[PDB]
Amino acid sequence: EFQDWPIVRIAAHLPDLIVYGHFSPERPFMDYFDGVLMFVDISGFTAMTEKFSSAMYMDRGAEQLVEILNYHISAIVEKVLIFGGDILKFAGDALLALWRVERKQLKNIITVVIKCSLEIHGLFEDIRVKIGLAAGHISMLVFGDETHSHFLVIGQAVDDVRLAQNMAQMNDVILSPNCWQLCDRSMIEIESVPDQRAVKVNFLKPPPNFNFDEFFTKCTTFMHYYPSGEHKNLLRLACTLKPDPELEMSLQKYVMESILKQIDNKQLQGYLSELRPVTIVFVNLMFEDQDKAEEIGPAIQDAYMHITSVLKIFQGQINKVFMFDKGCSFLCVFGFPGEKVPDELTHALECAMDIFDFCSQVHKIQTVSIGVASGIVFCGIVGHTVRHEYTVIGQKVNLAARMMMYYPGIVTCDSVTYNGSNLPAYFFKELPKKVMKGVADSGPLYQYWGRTEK
Ligand SMILES: Cn1cc(Cc2cccc(F)c2)c(-c2cc(Cl)nc(N)n2)n1
Numbered sequence: 539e540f541q542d543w544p545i546v547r548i549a550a551h552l553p554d555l556i557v558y559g560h561f562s563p564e565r566p567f568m569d570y571f572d573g574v575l576m577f578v579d580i581s582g583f584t585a586m587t588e589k590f591s592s593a594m595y596m597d598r599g600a601e602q603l604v605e606i607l608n609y610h611i612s613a614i615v616e617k618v619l620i621f622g623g624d625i626l627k628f629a630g631d632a633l634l635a636l637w638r639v640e641r642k643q644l645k646n647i648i649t650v651v652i653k654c655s656l657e658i659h660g661l662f663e664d665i666r667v668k669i670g671l672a673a674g675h676i677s678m679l680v681f682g683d684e685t686h687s688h689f690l691v692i693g694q695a696v697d698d699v700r701l702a703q704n705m706a707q708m709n710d711v712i713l714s715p716n717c718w719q720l721c722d723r724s725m726i727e728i729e730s731v732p733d734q735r736a737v738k739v740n741f742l743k744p745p746p747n748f749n750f751d752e753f754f755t756k757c758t759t760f761m762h763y764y765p766s767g768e769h770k771n772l773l774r775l776a777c778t779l780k781p782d783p784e785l786e787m788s789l790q791k792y793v794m795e796s797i798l799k800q801i802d803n804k805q806l807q808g809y810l811s812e813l814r815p816v817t818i819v820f821v822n823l824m825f826e827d828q829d830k831a832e833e834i835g836p837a838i839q840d841a842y843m844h845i846t847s848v849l850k851i852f853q854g855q856i857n858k859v860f861m862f863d864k865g866c867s868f869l870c871v872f873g874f875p876g877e878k879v880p881d882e883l884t885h886a887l888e889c890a891m892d893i894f895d896f897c898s899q900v901h902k903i904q905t906v907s908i909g910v911a912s913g914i915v916f917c918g919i920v921g922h923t924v925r926h927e928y929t930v931i932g933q934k935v936n937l938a939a940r941m942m943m944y945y946p947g948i949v950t951c952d953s954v955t956y957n958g959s960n961l962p963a964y965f966f967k968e969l970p971k972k973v974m975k976g977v978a979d980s981g982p983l984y985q986y987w988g989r990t991e992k
Pocket of ligand 1: 577626627628629630632633634689690691692696697699700701703859860861862
């Protein structure tokens with residue numbers, strides 16, 4: 539069975555949620571379902587990346603980093619896949635996976651996902667991970683324009699797995715309060731988490747009669763894309779995809795053009811693994827706690843239509859979009875594969891202020907925040923052969939990320955960007971530097987005030 543078609547290579551960059559969906563061209567598109575979510579904190583990615591920036595690695599730091607990272611990441615991915623999970627996105631500090639099933643089956647699936655989580659820690663019993671799990675209703679949002687598509691999962695189950703994540707320490711498996719209350723408590727031994735309603739999993743103690751293999755196989759009954767039969771030994775049914783122009787047209791909208799060129803063998807397969815000077819523009823769009831997903835979707839769509847238009851003007855791209863706690867965030871980048879223009883820093887700032895101005899006027903968006911940082915960041919395809927994504931990793935990525943969170947409502951920039959721009963000082967304001975989660979001495983942080991006082 540020949541399986542190396544372009545459509546198959548494109549599908550490697552996408553979850554089954556997108557590959558095997560069949561939904562309208564309307565944007566935004568929204569769908570609703572139930573499932574179990576898994577968030578694997580891999581940090582040790584942004585910790586290690588800056589070790590490989592040193593001269594000890596003799597200009598092969600990027601190639602060495604992608605190698606060892608994929609070694610560990612791909613092992614996590616294999617575990618997720620063989621347990622029936624769907625890896626939704628990679629984000630440098632973690633991956634998010636989904637077990638979509640009917641509500642009546644969440645109880646049994648939570649057990650599958652807990653066993654999966656425990657075997658993932660088994661792979662690493664320095665290098666360790668933290669796992670959060672949640673279960674309940676999930677909303678999917680698809681937004682984009684006629685040639686680009688993006689997706690997000692939204693809902694309390696998403697926010698639940700967010701908070702379960704941040705409690706875990708190395709080797710921990712934290713269950714969301716709803717996950718704990720929907721799970722098979724007769725089989726899961728838990729313990730308190732101080733003044734948090736989540737719980738930590740200590741042991742999986744099944745009845746004397748219980749055989750997980752038989753249990754798991756019956757659970758696969760409910761998995762609408764688990765490989766079986768002649769394809770029992772495939773990690774993804776997506777590997778069996780055959781040419782289909784209409785489907786490929788839809789799927790390629792989700793993938794960055796430079797990635798498509800590699801998939802088409804018009805670019806060296808190692809061209810995208812690099813430690814590169816870029817400028818990160820991290821945009822955050824905060825909505826109110828009361829907002830429903832049906833209001834958030836149209837707002838993100840309207841925001842995105844402007845963001846992409848400005849990014850193309852100033853020659854930037856969207857690398858990642860996230861959402862948790864009513865904040866939708868766009869990881870934008872300037873200066874990656876063929877986009878290194880001489881005045882990158884000035885354009886990043888003006889693009890940021892432009893995005894800030896417009897999105898601040900979109901209804902239902904209560905606050906816009908943008909952090910800008912410039913420096914060496916790792917760029918590469920991270921994951922497994924069958925499931926991988928282009929991702930940027932580095933401390934300047936994390937700095938832009940916390941800038942937009944710790945300095946809401948304004949456009950902030952780092953000292954590199956400030957000094958390097960061909961703009962005068964009064965366009966800026968030096969800021970009170972704040973204690974920021976796992977961030978070194980930033981250097982001076984600045985607000986991009988603009989060309990006028992008003
Ligand atoms: C690797 N990764 C990180 C995130 C952001 C996130 C979501 C939930 C809890 C967290 F702690 C962090 C996502 C993600 C993917 C999709 Cl499809 N939708 C949304 N909303 N987020 N992927």
